[PDB]
């Protein structure tokens, strides 16, 4: 269904896992939940929360929901250089234009999420729901173009077709 960036070989960064219930006679819930962010170890889009009858299916649901069945805004190369704010399904991440590479600091499990996402180069504060199941959206709302490549000639990139169109 939903198409994503390039990768070669994938890392199943499971950041969190949980269990749901509402057990009763006839129709019931008894499954497990799992949360994974999928990437290549530098920068890729993809985030999936899924659930199933047991722990093996729970994780396979989650890895499918990252890679398909999910709306994302795209990335190019494993680095950011279009730092801007945004909103996707209430979740707000703000990034002011500053240095690339160095300055990276974010608490709890989030510094590890940012390394597979490609936006550990430029980053600033989060607002809206502050839970690690929904704020991993960094490379989506915090990137409002479909490519943000590492050559600074990116701002001449669309220009070279526009003045040839003149």
């Amino acid at each position: 269904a939903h198409i994503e960036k390039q990768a070669g070989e994938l890392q199943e960064k499971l950041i969190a896992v949980n269990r749901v219930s509402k057990t009763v006679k006839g129709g019931r819930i008894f499954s497990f939940t799992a949360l994974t962010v999928v990437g290549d170890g530098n920068g890729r889009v993809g985030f999936g929360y899924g659930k199933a009858r047991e722990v093996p299916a729970a994780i396979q649901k989650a890895m499918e929901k990252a890679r398909r069945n999910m709306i994302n805004v795209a990335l190019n190369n494993g680095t950011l250089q279009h730092p801007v704010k945004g909103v996707h399904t209430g979740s707000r991440v703000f990034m002011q234009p500053a240095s690339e590479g160095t300055g990276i600091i974010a608490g709890g499990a989030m510094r590890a999420v940012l390394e597979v996402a490609g936006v550990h180069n430029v980053l600033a504060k989060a607002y809206g729901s502050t839970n690690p199941i929904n704020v991993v959206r960094a490379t989506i709302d915090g990137l409002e173009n479909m490519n943000s490549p590492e050559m600074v000639a990116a701002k001449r990139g669309k220009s070279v077709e526009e003045i040839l169109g003149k």
Binding site: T102, G103, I104, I105, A106, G107, G108, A109, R111
Partner: protein, 205 residues
């Protein structure tokens, strides 16, 4: 100021011997350390962003034979003479008189080495300099005060050390009880687990 006390405990998390208590008991062998220490070890531990920062500050406190409090002044000097902060801080950590003393061999442990500083057995420029935090630069000379050139324990430590604790950035002579420190190293020569730019991002915000 030499901390010690509950000394081995911090190595027992760390999996490096931290240079404290070497010999025949640096990482395991007669040392009982991470060979199921205690009466527990079945449960899953948890980490955070502050957990890897804390672990890496713990590493760097003991490997240079310093403290958190010593390392705060080392940063107050690192910013004042400006560059890349993490680079500057290590130059100063590795620039301690206790670390020149340690790498030359004159004590084969952090506690030994710093003791020979403090207890006036170490001289810089032929005058006794009893401060481990004394700054030492390339082609400077360390030498031993007279009433301490009779140490049996000095002679013993240099030979335990012989071409297994002695680095190539220095020279020493085990007969004259004196040496020239020829070059201050950086992280490319040393161990590459410790990181001091990440620790300044923590203390700045």
């Amino acid at each position: 100021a030499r901390y010690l006390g509950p000394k081995l405990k911090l190595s027992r998390r760390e999996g490096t011997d931290l240079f404290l208590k070497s010999g025949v008991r640096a990482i395991d062998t007669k040392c009982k350390i991470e060979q199921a220490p205690g009466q527990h070890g079945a449960r899953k531990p948890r980490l955070s962003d502050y957990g890897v920062q804390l672990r890496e500050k713990q590493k760097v406190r003991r490997i240079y034979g310093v403290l958190e409090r010593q390392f705060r002044n080392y940063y107050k000097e690192a910013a004042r003479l400006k560059g890349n902060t993490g680079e500057n801080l290590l130059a100063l950590l590795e620039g301690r008189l206790d670390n020149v003393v340690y790498r030359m061999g004159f004590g084969a442990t952090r506690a030994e080495a710093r003791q020979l500083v403090s207890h006036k057995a170490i001289m810089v420029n032929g005058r006794v300099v009893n401060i481990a935090s004394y700054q030492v630069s390339p082609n400077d000379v360390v030498s031993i005060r007279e009433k301490a050139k009779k140490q049996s324990r000095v002679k013993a430590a240099l030979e335990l050390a012989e071409q297994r604790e002695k680095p190539t950035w220095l020279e020493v002579d085990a007969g004259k009880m004196e040496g020239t420190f020829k070059r201050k190293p950086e992280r490319s020569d040393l161990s590459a687990d410790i990181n001091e730019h990440l620790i300044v991002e923590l203390y700045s915000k």
